[PDB]
Structure 1
Amino acid sequence: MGNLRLIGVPESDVENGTKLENTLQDIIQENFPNLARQANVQIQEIQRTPQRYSSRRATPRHIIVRFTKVEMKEKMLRAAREKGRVTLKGKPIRLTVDLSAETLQARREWGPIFNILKEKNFQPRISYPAKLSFISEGEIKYFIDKQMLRDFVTTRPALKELLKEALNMERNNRYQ
């Protein structure tokens, strides 16, 4: 599911799926010795893109890696950030992923709610994409959209007052 972007892999006439897979494994060993030792990396597919359409830019085409375990992919990214230097066969390369701007906006919207809950010993935590979860009265509650949070507070006046400013549900009668 989780897809990773590998940038800076030179091209070769003899390129083929098998060789590509070996390449990724090599990267792991070169920069992430820990990952290589574990040997718990399950890759589903590795291919070059665009396979049939030439790249408008003079730079080398990118390789897309699809990992079986989303968690595993995330770990790899973290490792790269820590090392500060990732190389393939001694040459410098870059490892990154594409993220949607919508996600960032969501986090900002939840900003007020998160901070207030922290102060009040609610233990607020955020999970990808932008789901809000926290512990209240001894039980764990999860909400995906701010709309849910509104429907929830209606039944606990204390909570409503605390979050009143966070949700800003006192501007326009209509939603959106």
Structure 2
Amino acid sequence: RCDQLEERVSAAEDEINEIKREGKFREKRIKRNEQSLQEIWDYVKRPNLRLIGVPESDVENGTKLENTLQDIIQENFPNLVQIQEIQRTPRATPRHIIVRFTKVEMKEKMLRAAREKGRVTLKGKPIRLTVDLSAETLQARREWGPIFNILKEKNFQPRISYPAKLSFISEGEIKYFIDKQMLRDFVTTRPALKELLKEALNM
């Protein structure tokens, strides 16, 4: 009676380890899917562009928006179009506008022009243009913040790029980092950066 309960417990302890082991593999697969989904939303949203702070208009149509876009380009980037779809999205502020361009080149060309100008205005009113990314990647850039700040202050010229890379000057050369772990390996090689981003990287 005491031995039967013992062997029963033993068998159970085995099932549990087996269940845990399987859970680990399962985990590793759910994580790969989450990353696959991230990469794909960024890939799809590649020719997209967010227009932020554009005055709403009583009864807007798809045609109205396209004209607005050209007004923006006219007012900001003269020297500089085909749209597959342009529309609002989907709190009391003007909704964003997604502009899916037919070509990715176009999306890039307008961001480059907007970054060189600094101030982008629509009828004097400063509007804002920015890439369209997946919530995941979007939250990845926001997590660079703390580190970005520290590098910013200490004149490292930090810079976040697609998808959510972090780049800055170290030895007269730009160093790109895909995640925090990659950066962790780099800081351990330079004493200066190591003690400067120690807490940030949570080492």
Give TM-score scaled by structure 2 length.
Answer: 0.44
Residues 136 and 67 of structure 1: CA distance in aligned 2, closer, same or farther (over 3 Å): same
SS in structure 2 of the partner of residue 112 of structure 1: helix
Corresponding position of 2:166: 132
Higher helix share: 2
Q: C-alpha displacement at 1:148, in angstroms?
A: 17
Q: C-alpha displacement at 1:166, in angstroms?
A: 22
Q: C-alpha displacement at 1:145, in angstroms?
A: 14
> Once structures 1 and 2 are overlaid, which stretch shifts more, 137-146 or 75-84?
137-146
Larger relative contact order, structure 1 or 2 (CA cutoff 8 Å, min sep 6): 1
Residues 160 and 95 of structure 1: CA distance in aligned 2, closer, same or farther (over 3 Å): closer
* CA distance in 1: counterparts of 2:142 and 2:94, whole angstroms: 36
* CA distance in 2: counterparts of 1:111 and 1:60, whole angstroms: 26
Q: C-alpha displacement at 1:13, in angstroms?
A: 1.4
Q: C-alpha displacement at 1:135, in angstroms?
A: 23
Q: C-alpha displacement at 1:4, in angstroms?
A: 0.3
Q: C-alpha displacement at 1:143, in angstroms?
A: 16
Q: Deviations over 1:12-55 (max 9, x none)?
A: 213111111100111111100111xxxxx2111111112xxxxx
How many pairs align? 156
Q: C-alpha displacement at 1:96, in angstroms?
A: 1.0
Answering whether residue 162 of structure 2 is matched by residue 117 of structure 1, we say: no
* CA distance in 2: counterparts of 1:49 and 1:151, whole angstroms: 41
Q: Residues 81-92 of structure 1: matches in 2 within 5 Å? A: 81-92=115-126
Residues 46 and 151 of structure 1: CA distance in aligned 2, closer, same or farther (over 3 Å): same
Residues 86 and 112 of structure 1: CA distance in aligned 2, closer, same or farther (over 3 Å): closer
Residues 162 and 34 of structure 1: CA distance in aligned 2, closer, same or farther (over 3 Å): same
> Once structures 1 and 2 are overlaid, which stretch shifts more, 61-70 or 113-122?
113-122
Give TM-score scaled by structure 1 length.
Answer: 0.50
SS in structure 2 of the partner of residue 121 of structure 1: coil
In terms of Rg, which structure is larger? Answer: 2
Corresponding position of 2:56: 11
Equivalent pairs: percent with the same residue? 100
> Once structures 1 and 2 are overlaid, which stretch shifts more, 72-81 or 103-112?
103-112
Residues 152 and 75 of structure 1: CA distance in aligned 2, closer, same or farther (over 3 Å): same
